[PDB]
Design a protein around this ligand. Structure first.
Ligand SMILES: CCCCCCCc1sc(N)nc1C(=O)O
Ligand SMILES: [Zn+2]
Ligand SMILES: [Zn+2]
Length: 231
């Protein structure tokens, strides 16, 4: 029932219910000659919705907001981007134009700027160092250290024990690290552990690409990362 890359034409967005008031959103996009799926999160925030991450581009992010409105019907009032790449900030200008207040860490916005990506409007304070946590309406943002990228956040929904790993967490189906350009493979295993350490109660674990899972996804990524520093 979880939608796969071949079932989502580029430009469409699926929503998938994970728990009460917690959905993921799944889109698809070309990168370097192939199309990949991508997840973010939607969390009910009282009478509003918090968005974790764009749907990877302006057209995708538009289709995201239209599906949200058709299937859920509450306004998206804020969004957080969890690192600076395009599958996370690409679409922030569409969100801004729709009326969404967009947020990321100061590191993330700096790095988006340097890279030429869309820049979320508002800075998130309190996340500067490996281990920091802040409350953000119905979720907790947490900086576990460098992994996929030096800025990558993860997100936890306490009410529903959902842990969103962003691109720092892989799906079991996946066995090569693939593009790790902006990564830090020395710190990545240690950063995955700070998560295991802070969220041992996590029932649902969502990587940035592919199928949801449980905490086993943590260890699975560590291994797939180590496999690439050895060779
Ligand atoms: C089983 C194949 C699973 C998909 C590989 C993803 C490769 C891409 S594309 C993009 N925008 N981000 C990534 C990433 O690794 O974070
Ligand atoms: Zn990335
Ligand atoms: Zn990614």
């Amino acid at each position: 029932e979880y939608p796969t890359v071949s079932e989502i034409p580029v430009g469409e967005v699926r929503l998938y219910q994970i728990a009460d008031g917690v959905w993921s959103h799944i889109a698809t996009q070309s990168f370097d000659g192939a199309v990949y799926p991508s997840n973010g999160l939607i969390v009910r925030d009282g009478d509003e919705l918090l968005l974790i991450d764009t749907a990877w581009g302006a057209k995708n992010t538009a289709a995201l907001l239209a599906e949200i409105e058709k299937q859920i019907g509450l306004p998206v009032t804020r969004a957080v981007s969890t690192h600076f790449h395009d599958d996370r900030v690409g679409g922030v200008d569409v969100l801004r134009a729709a009326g969404v207040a967009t947020y990321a860490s100061p590191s993330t916005r700096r790095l988006a700027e340097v890279e030429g990506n869309e820049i979320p409007t508002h800075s998130l304070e309190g996340l500067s160092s490996s281990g920091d946590a802040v409350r953000f309406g119905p979720v907790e943002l947490f900086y576990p250290g460098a992994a996929h990228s030096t800025d990558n956040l993860v997100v936890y929904v306490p009410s529903a024990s959902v842990l969103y790993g962003g691109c720092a967490i892989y799906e079991l189906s996946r066995t090569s690290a693939g593009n790790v350009a902006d990564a830090d493979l020395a710190e990545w295993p240690t950063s995955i552990e700070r998560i295991q350490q802070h969220y041992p109660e996590a029932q649902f674990v969502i990587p940035g690409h592919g199928l949801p899972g449980g905490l086993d996804l943590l260890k699975h990524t560590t291994n797939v990362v180590k496999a690439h520093t050895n060779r």
